[PDB]
Amino acid sequence: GTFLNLTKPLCEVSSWHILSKDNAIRIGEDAHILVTREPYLSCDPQGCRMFALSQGTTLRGRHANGTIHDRSPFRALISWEMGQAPSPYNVRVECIGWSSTSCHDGISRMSICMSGPNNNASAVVWYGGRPVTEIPSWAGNILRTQESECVCHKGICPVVMTDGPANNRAATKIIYFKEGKIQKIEELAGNAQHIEECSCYGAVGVIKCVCRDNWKGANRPVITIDPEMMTHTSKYLCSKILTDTSRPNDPTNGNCDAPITGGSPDPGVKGFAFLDGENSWLGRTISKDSRSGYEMLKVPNAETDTQSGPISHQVIVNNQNWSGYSGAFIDYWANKECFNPCFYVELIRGRPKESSVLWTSNSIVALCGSKERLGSWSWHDGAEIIYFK
Amino acid sequence: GTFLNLTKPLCEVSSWHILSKDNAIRIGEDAHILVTREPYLSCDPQGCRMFALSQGTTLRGRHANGTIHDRSPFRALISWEMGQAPSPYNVRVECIGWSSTSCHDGISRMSICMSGPNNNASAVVWYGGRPVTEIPSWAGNILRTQESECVCHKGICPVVMTDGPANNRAATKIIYFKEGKIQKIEELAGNAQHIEECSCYGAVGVIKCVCRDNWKGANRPVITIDPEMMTHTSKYLCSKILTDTSRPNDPTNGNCDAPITGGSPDPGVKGFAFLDGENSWLGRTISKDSRSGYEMLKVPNAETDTQSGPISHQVIVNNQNWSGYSGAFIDYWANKECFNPCFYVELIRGRPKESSVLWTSNSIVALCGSKERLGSWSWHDGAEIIYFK
Amino acid sequence: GTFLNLTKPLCEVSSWHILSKDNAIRIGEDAHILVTREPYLSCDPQGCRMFALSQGTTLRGRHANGTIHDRSPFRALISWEMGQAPSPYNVRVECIGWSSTSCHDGISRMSICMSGPNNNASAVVWYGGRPVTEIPSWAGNILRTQESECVCHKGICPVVMTDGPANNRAATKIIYFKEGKIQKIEELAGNAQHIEECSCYGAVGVIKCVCRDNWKGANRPVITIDPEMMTHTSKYLCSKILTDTSRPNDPTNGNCDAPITGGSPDPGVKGFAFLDGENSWLGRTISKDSRSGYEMLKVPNAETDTQSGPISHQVIVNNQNWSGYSGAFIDYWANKECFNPCFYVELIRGRPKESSVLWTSNSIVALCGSKERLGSWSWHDGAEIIYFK
Amino acid sequence: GTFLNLTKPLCEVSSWHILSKDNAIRIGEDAHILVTREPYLSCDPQGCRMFALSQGTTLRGRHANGTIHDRSPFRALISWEMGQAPSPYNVRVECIGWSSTSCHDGISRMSICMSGPNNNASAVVWYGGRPVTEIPSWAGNILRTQESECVCHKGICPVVMTDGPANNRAATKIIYFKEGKIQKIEELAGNAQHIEECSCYGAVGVIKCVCRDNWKGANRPVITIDPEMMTHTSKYLCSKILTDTSRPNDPTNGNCDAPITGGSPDPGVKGFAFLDGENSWLGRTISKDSRSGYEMLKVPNAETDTQSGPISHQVIVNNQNWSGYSGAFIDYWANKECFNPCFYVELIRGRPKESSVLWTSNSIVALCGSKERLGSWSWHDGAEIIYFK
Ligand SMILES: *[C@@H]1O[C@H](CO)[C@@H](O[C@@H]2O[C@H](CO)[C@@H](O[C@@H]3O[C@H](CO[C@H]4O[C@H](CO[C@H]5O[C@H](CO)[C@@H](O)[C@H](O)[C@@H]5O)[C@@H](O)[C@H](O[C@H]5O[C@H](CO)[C@@H](O)[C@H](O)[C@@H]5O)[C@@H]4O)[C@@H](O)[C@H](O)[C@@H]3O)[C@H](O)[C@H]2NC(C)=O)[C@H](O)[C@H]1NC(C)=O
Ligand SMILES: *[C@@H]1O[C@H](CO)[C@@H](O[C@@H]2O[C@H](CO)[C@@H](O[C@@H]3O[C@H](CO[C@H]4O[C@H](CO[C@H]5O[C@H](CO)[C@@H](O)[C@H](O)[C@@H]5O)[C@@H](O)[C@H](O[C@H]5O[C@H](CO)[C@@H](O)[C@H](O)[C@@H]5O)[C@@H]4O)[C@@H](O)[C@H](O)[C@@H]3O)[C@H](O)[C@H]2NC(C)=O)[C@H](O)[C@H]1NC(C)=O
Ligand SMILES: *[C@@H]1O[C@H](CO)[C@@H](O[C@@H]2O[C@H](CO)[C@@H](O[C@@H]3O[C@H](CO[C@H]4O[C@H](CO[C@H]5O[C@H](CO)[C@@H](O)[C@H](O)[C@@H]5O)[C@@H](O)[C@H](O[C@H]5O[C@H](CO)[C@@H](O)[C@H](O)[C@@H]5O)[C@@H]4O)[C@@H](O)[C@H](O)[C@@H]3O)[C@H](O)[C@H]2NC(C)=O)[C@H](O)[C@H]1NC(C)=O
Ligand SMILES: *[C@@H]1O[C@H](CO)[C@@H](O[C@@H]2O[C@H](CO)[C@@H](O[C@@H]3O[C@H](CO[C@H]4O[C@H](CO[C@H]5O[C@H](CO)[C@@H](O)[C@H](O)[C@@H]5O)[C@@H](O)[C@H](O[C@H]5O[C@H](CO)[C@@H](O)[C@H](O)[C@@H]5O)[C@@H]4O)[C@@H](O)[C@H](O)[C@@H]3O)[C@H](O)[C@H]2NC(C)=O)[C@H](O)[C@H]1NC(C)=O
Ligand SMILES: *[C@@H]1O[C@H](CO)[C@@H](O[C@@H]2O[C@H](CO)[C@@H](O[C@@H]3O[C@H](CO)[C@@H](O)[C@H](O)[C@@H]3O)[C@H](O)[C@H]2NC(C)=O)[C@H](O)[C@H]1NC(C)=O
Ligand SMILES: *[C@@H]1O[C@H](CO)[C@@H](O[C@@H]2O[C@H](CO)[C@@H](O[C@@H]3O[C@H](CO)[C@@H](O)[C@H](O)[C@@H]3O)[C@H](O)[C@H]2NC(C)=O)[C@H](O)[C@H]1NC(C)=O
Ligand SMILES: CO[C@@H]([C@@H]1OC(C(=O)O)=C[C@H](NC(=N)N)[C@H]1NC(C)=O)[C@H](O)CO
Ligand SMILES: CO[C@@H]([C@@H]1OC(C(=O)O)=C[C@H](NC(=N)N)[C@H]1NC(C)=O)[C@H](O)CO
Ligand SMILES: CO[C@@H]([C@@H]1OC(C(=O)O)=C[C@H](NC(=N)N)[C@H]1NC(C)=O)[C@H](O)CO
Ligand SMILES: CO[C@@H]([C@@H]1OC(C(=O)O)=C[C@H](NC(=N)N)[C@H]1NC(C)=O)[C@H](O)CO
Ligand SMILES: [Ca+2]
Ligand SMILES: [Ca+2]
Ligand SMILES: [Ca+2]
Ligand SMILES: [Ca+2]
């Protein structure tokens, strides 16, 4: 292998084609399928794999009771062959913990998991399947990270991590890794007031991360990283089209420099956007209140124009169905002249919205860009909650 | 690897020997086995694999209820090691959708799946395990394809696709792929009035496809393709021995140029034939009404002689047992001086004929030619439907 | 790889050490384990694997009902990693049928399965994972073979096959294969009156097979093969120590040339012996009536001396436990200066002796020679039949 | 591969980071997970794997009843991918028996299992996946070994084995293997009065084993081995901090040369320590009576100073949770300039402490050293015993 260099431009995207869907909850109704949440996909020169945080129990198992809980000693980052559902028989355990990121640098995979008590968490950084670096909490308040893939360039893989309050100012850092070893640490700069769960992708030597402000904004922070100089800037997505959940109705004008407040009752959800001038796409839940539905909106100059609105759209999950986290990934090793945007949607089932069952889990759907105008339908989870009762 | 060239003649066949049988319904009564339908086999330089369209649930799972349904967001083309039954633990997800084809060109495997709503379906073409091409519906009416393997020659893999009515004239095309990229598109020519679900095989630079006319004919359309010139002709199988289901009693004379109408109540089933002058074999269900039984009939000059009849036969599935789809494949990489014909029979269990259960699934049996005169017995599914009730 | 040559002598054996045990019935009480019978082991340059005839259902599955039945379209030769229990998730399907043999020639594995109706069975010969040769029944009466491994020398792999009555004279042949292709066919010569289920091993250019006479003898036929000249002789094991089941009490004198009759009520069981002058070991069930217990007896010159008796023994399965078939195999690719004898015992559970359950299956234990004097205990199946009721 | 040489010093350790956790009992409540005990981890150039002694049944299976029993013909040493739970579908059977050790010499893995009756047990030594050496019991009283990994240096892998009483003087030997072949046998020397279940690690040409005295001492024997000269010494851990279970309260002064008696009611448990001057860490159960809790104590000069006490600590399992065996391993092939200490804790569930269920099994947690001061929490098993009732 050789280090991945972000030499290619982002592919132009007119619509989104289906890449994978694991149907994990449908299958797990009667097969041995692990309870998960916070899934994503990440690729390497050989292909793409699914990742998620296991809860250390099967879906039909009695220990699925209580799995709304975010952090326990029984969680682990697992990865498995794309399209399969995660079972205790087919998963690779990448690391142990309850917040993660992973990316392949062209030679080996780096995986990072945080674990431990809220006031004393720590990250273990794995490279090539072995632990190489450990990082203690710097603020004593739930050290945590992206919950989707990082991006590498010339062997340098930046990772955004946050430690501190979910509902007040926190301490966010960008750590630049090479072979799992810290090359540089930056404190977050810029105008984003709060940063969690960054979804990142790269093209032409630039890494862009679209994140979650859990404190104030219904608009999403955007971090722009130069992995060569190891420097960054941050602000908010300018567009009036707000993409956090919960959020208020979209105003007539967005805000690049400050959080747009409002919405009820959730303070945030992980999400993403591809930001490339006219070739810009924003994902969001269809409901402004809850994690239901998912739509892709083509919003030219969303990153820079406070008045930018949608010129096209594609419903990914209809609003009668539950969604969840969403994030970016790219098959940087595809046989193409451009890097083609891909994304996944986490389809959360169970608590708290379906509180008739005792568990919380998800399945995954993933799509990639097409220059064609492709028809669309809803790629909802497809399980009947009544079958679990 | 090097591109497969169809340089060899078709092997002479006197009888059929057992190749594989997965016993999927028997096993799935108590193991975690995926609900499937529309199966086939396809080979590569390493060996042969089984393929089918999953329904995204196990057979004993509650979500098996309703799996008579043809098209949903929970279906995918899966492949697995020949002889094993398909489980969520052992399958490779080739692509996502509800109609498929797949073939190996000698270097990598191309897999194609259609998905989406009836009026806006699309094909995603995968090559070497990555998506490379997308094709939108051209007629807005269930874009669909072969449901068995395609065939490649010098890197060129033609695929027959249809978009339009199941019960009226439709828009069929032959798309010639190379590395999953479109080289040429032809509109279907010839006298076949309606084309679905082509079963194809190749020898000496010729690709022959035997298809399903769902509109009029109880005789099967035959498409003859030159993968070098990328041109084709089409007509009907000439023999009076009719091989669609449903069909009327065989007349005294077949018809090469026009559909022979009649039969009740089904308009069609996927099937196949090997057409090589005196070395010609037709498969069909034993019942002229329903998908029950399966027989191989040696009908010399079936392709060209309207009066041709059987000179030998071999029952594959007795008429007291359910059959289903059937199709052609060949291990083009076998250590032999000729390409030996193989075929599979889909053994459908459940709805609509066994409506005492809520599901529809199948198992697979596959056989290959022998120059020996081998004894035969019935290779039925072998599950007891009562055990599922 | 290079062809295996039988250049080495047989190792001296003083006792038997444990090699593997799959505990298949214990595990299968609650895991997805295939119903099997007629198991064996066979090695290759990479290691050893377990083989058996699947019944195409799991042990706890409803289709296990009726699995006392010997021959059905739902059986297949399966192989799996030594020590694991056979599941639908971990087995390789070698071929389809209800009688088998398999062996590796140093380059690739040959596997043979018979299938079909009693009066019209056929063998399909596979080599390197592909079917290469087909053989029709020559006597129209259950064409069948060894049910344990064959042996190869300089690419030549002889296989003993029988077609005809189980209770009268039958037509036995030795077929000499190379790369799955017939090199020569011999009709059985010698004084053995009936030959079934040969257990074979090789050393110094000689292949010896110890078989089952189902017609007359309670003494076992022995076939001695020269795989270079492709010729053989046959007679009975000379020793007064009789090793078929059922059998009468051992007489004062054995018989080399003719069957010793008597015993009740079973006409035979597959078994084996290692015959090397003073270094000779006979296996047999402990009960002279039934398939219970298993003992290894060191009987110097058993092959040639009608008065030879045991000078040492090792109980493998105590007589309070069920046994079954037994057979020979050798890791011909071991890092040793001699070929070390190994054997397996099939531990049959269920019908007909435990008719309180509806099924018949087995687990496996396998042992190899040691020059040490090792302590021994019983390696019985270990399942409680009551747990299955 | 090339032989591992113990050329590197031991890494300095300030705290312990999470390496792996399989959650086997949680998962096994509803998945097919093997009953085990006596687990460990062992690495090779490719990575690390989990090992344990299977009981030849699943956890939910009826045959789990009675698995408190230590020795049966249904046990085997199994290994599996680190982090997964052990299932009959994912384990490699290393050898058959009820006491084991395993280690990789840089080229291949040696695995050893004892099996047989108490008065006639024997070890089978496997190398490169094949049996190479057999060793009969020398004292006729439960020949047994380490239950964690051995250590290799220049191809020489010493193994500590004991044969004789659990409650009186026994016959312990160190056997020096190369490629599974005995190079030398030493009778145990030194002042340790009784030696069982040694936990070993190596650095700078020295192998140190920390063991269990089941006869007298609540202090742990320490064996120091020179794998080049193939010689050793033994005595007790000097520290007043006693680390066997059961044990009395720690005295004011430890004892290097003689057992410190007392404690009730258990005579011993397998444990470990890393002994490197000031860089010394002792593990022990938190309860002095029972196998509950687990703590790591940094005790400078524990090996040599009878008055040495803890200067820091880290709770691994809180005292409200069950622990069990603990042992040492090191990834000798890590990309580091020092050998970093790792350890596992066996988390025993079921009998005899939870006698409300009929079974005994365990899960695994494993941790490795860090020079960072990392926060900690309890890594208990996490299953609810009530769910199994
Ligand atoms: C076969 O497949 C084709 C390819 O997939 C498909 O092509 C699609 O065709 C449709 C119809 O021509 C096109 O729709 C167009 O979309 C743009 C953008 O619409 C989006 O944004 C507007 C504006 O939203 C903002 O303003 C409103 C207030 O005005 C606020 O509520 C909102 O929050 C924003 O602030 C929005 O109104 C649209 O809403 C629609 O869609 C959402 C889901 O996203 C629904 O929840 C909602 O009820 C409503 O239906 C939408 O979000 C719009 O400006 C145009 O007027 C036009 O509607 C698609 O872009 C196009 N897609 C692609 C990928 O080409 C074919 O239609 C299909 N054929 C058939 C027969 O099905
Ligand atoms: C050991 O194994 C041997 C190898 O497998 C096996 O060999 C077989 O031997 C039989 C008997 O000699 C041969 O049978 C021959 O078959 C031909 C062709 O028969 C087929 O076609 C005719 C004509 O069908 C058309 O016409 C009728 C009206 O006349 C219409 O109904 C029909 O729709 C067509 O339009 C057909 O009548 C036959 O029907 C038989 O078989 C079908 C199943 O296909 C049954 O449903 C039906 O009830 C009837 O039994 C058949 O379809 C025929 O012309 C000859 O007269 C002769 O019957 C096999 O060809 C031969 N097979 C091979 C591969 O060599 C041995 O028999 C076996 N030994 C034993 C003891 O079992
Ligand atoms: C630790 O392990 C050691 C190694 O495993 C073990 O060593 C064993 O020690 C014993 C005792 O010294 C030795 O036993 C010897 O065996 C020979 C051969 O015995 C076998 O054959 C005779 C003769 O059978 C024929 O004749 C009789 C009529 O006389 C017929 O019934 C029969 O059908 C034949 O025609 C037979 O009588 C023996 O029967 C015994 O064993 C069978 C099981 O095979 C039982 O069913 C039966 O009830 C009876 O117990 C036997 O089949 C014998 O001639 C000697 O007199 C002596 O008995 C072992 O050979 C030896 N094994 C090895 C591998 O070295 C240690 O004993 C063990 N230590 C402890 C404490 O357990
Ligand atoms: C974020 O994470 C940090 C890193 O993990 C963590 O850092 C830890 O900080 C604590 C507090 O400053 C340090 O604790 C120190 O530990 C030493 C050693 O204590 C151990 O040994 C003593 C002595 O035991 C012997 O003597 C007594 C009689 O006096 C006997 O009972 C005993 O059997 C021995 O003979 C012992 O008393 C201690 O007992 C404590 O811990 C045990 C568990 O091991 C409990 O069961 C018990 O109830 C009690 O709590 C202990 O065994 C001690 O001398 C110091 O005074 C101080 O207590 C840790 O060393 C340190 N760890 C590391 C790895 O750096 C931070 O605390 C954490 N932050 C937060 C907010 O949680
Ligand atoms: C298998 O799937 C079928 C189809 O989904 C299930 O049948 C359906 O069951 C639901 C729930 O009882 C029925 O819904 C009801 O419909 C009536 C009339 O529309 C409405 O008034 C009620 O409030 C309720 O919505 C539905 O009609 C019914 N459909 C059919 C065709 O029978 C069936 O229960 C499933 N079986 C199993 C064993 O899971
Ligand atoms: C778990 O395993 C234990 C131990 O095998 C089972 O308990 C045993 O059950 C058997 C059958 O009921 C008892 O056998 C009986 O013993 C009496 C007295 O010896 C005898 O007179 C009877 O004819 C019969 O043989 C056995 O005593 C009993 N052992 C103990 C220690 O209780 C138990 O049933 C198993 N539990 C489950 C849920 O499988
Ligand atoms: C605590 O809540 C945070 C995370 O949010 C939630 C969610 O569904 O919204 C999922 C995570 N679950 C896991 N990653 N396991 C959380 N993050 C963690 C570390 O708990 C939030 O971002 C506030 O800081
Ligand atoms: C809709 O019916 C078509 C297909 O037919 C049926 C069948 O059992 O006959 C199976 C397919 N199921 C799947 N491939 N899933 C269909 N084809 C599709 C695309 O639905 C028919 O050929 C008419 O156009
Ligand atoms: C029919 O009985 C024969 C075979 O014997 C039996 C047995 O348990 O004794 C197992 C086989 N089961 C299978 N191999 N499946 C048989 N052999 C066959 C071909 O049925 C016997 O050797 C007489 O010819
Ligand atoms: C018999 O007890 C010994 C072993 O101890 C126990 C235990 O939980 O304490 C587990 C083992 N279980 C297994 N390894 N299976 C034993 N060791 C054996 C060989 O039984 C002890 O060390 C006394 O000699
Ligand atoms: Ca927010
Ligand atoms: Ca038709
Ligand atoms: Ca006999
Ligand atoms: Ca002790």
Side-chain angles (χ1 to χ4, degrees), chain B residues 103-160:
Chain B
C103 48
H104 199 283
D105 65 13
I107 303 181
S108 300
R109 175 161 294 282
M110 181 182 65
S111 299
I112 303 177
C113 292
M114 282 70 164
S115 80
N118 300 342
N119 69 352
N120 232 347
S122 54
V124 179
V125 182
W126 294 61
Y127 186 73
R130 296 176 142 105
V132 298
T133 298
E134 311 84 50
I135 306 166
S137 176
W138 51 82
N141 195 349
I142 316 178
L143 176 64
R144 56 200 185 271
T145 188
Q146 297 177 199
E147 325 293 3
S148 65
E149 79 169 5
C150 35
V151 186
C152 304
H153 174 71
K154 296 181 178 174
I156 303 296
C157 311
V159 175
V160 185

Side-chain angles (χ1 to χ4, degrees), chain B residues 48-113:
Chain B
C48 301
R49 289 168 66 73
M50 281 167 171
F51 289 74
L53 293 175
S54 175
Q55 290 272 20
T57 174
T58 60
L59 181 59
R60 277 304 203 171
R62 296 294 299 268
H63 300 276
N65 176 16
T67 46
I68 194 178
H69 196 68
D70 280 311
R71 300 175 301 281
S72 82
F74 325 117
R75 303 206 75 173
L77 175 61
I78 49 161
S79 67
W80 65 96
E81 183 170 326
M82 181 176 69
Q84 284 188 343
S87 75
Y89 315 131
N90 77 336
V91 296
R92 175 179 306 157
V93 180
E94 297 276 337
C95 43
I96 307 300
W98 39 243
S99 185
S100 83
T101 185
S102 187
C103 48
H104 199 283
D105 65 13
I107 303 181
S108 300
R109 175 161 294 282
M110 181 182 65
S111 299
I112 303 177
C113 292

Side-chain angles (χ1 to χ4, degrees), chain A residues 320-384:
Chain A
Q320 299 73 61
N321 292 278
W322 300 113
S323 53
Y325 278 15
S326 53
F329 66 103
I330 291 183
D331 184 359
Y332 296 100
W333 301 266
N335 184 28
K336 301 194 177 163
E337 294 173 2
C338 50
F339 291 144
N340 196 36
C342 297
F343 72 95
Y344 64 87
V345 183
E346 172 192 39
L347 308 169
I348 304 176
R349 299 306 301 271
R351 302 198 152 189
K353 290 294 180 301
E354 305 174 295
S355 50
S356 42
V357 293
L358 298 169
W359 50 262
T360 296
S361 196
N362 70 283
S363 65
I364 307 171
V365 64
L367 297 88
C368 292
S370 175
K371 290 186 285 172
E372 298 297 323
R373 213 154 101 85
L374 305 175
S376 59
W377 65 355
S378 172
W379 294 99
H380 43 281
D381 170 72
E384 293 291 342

Side-chain angles (χ1 to χ4, degrees), chain C residues 296-311:
Chain C
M296 290 303 294
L297 308 172
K298 192 171 189 174
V299 181
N301 303 309
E303 187 175 14
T304 61
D305 187 356
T306 58
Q307 284 174 329
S308 51
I311 60 164

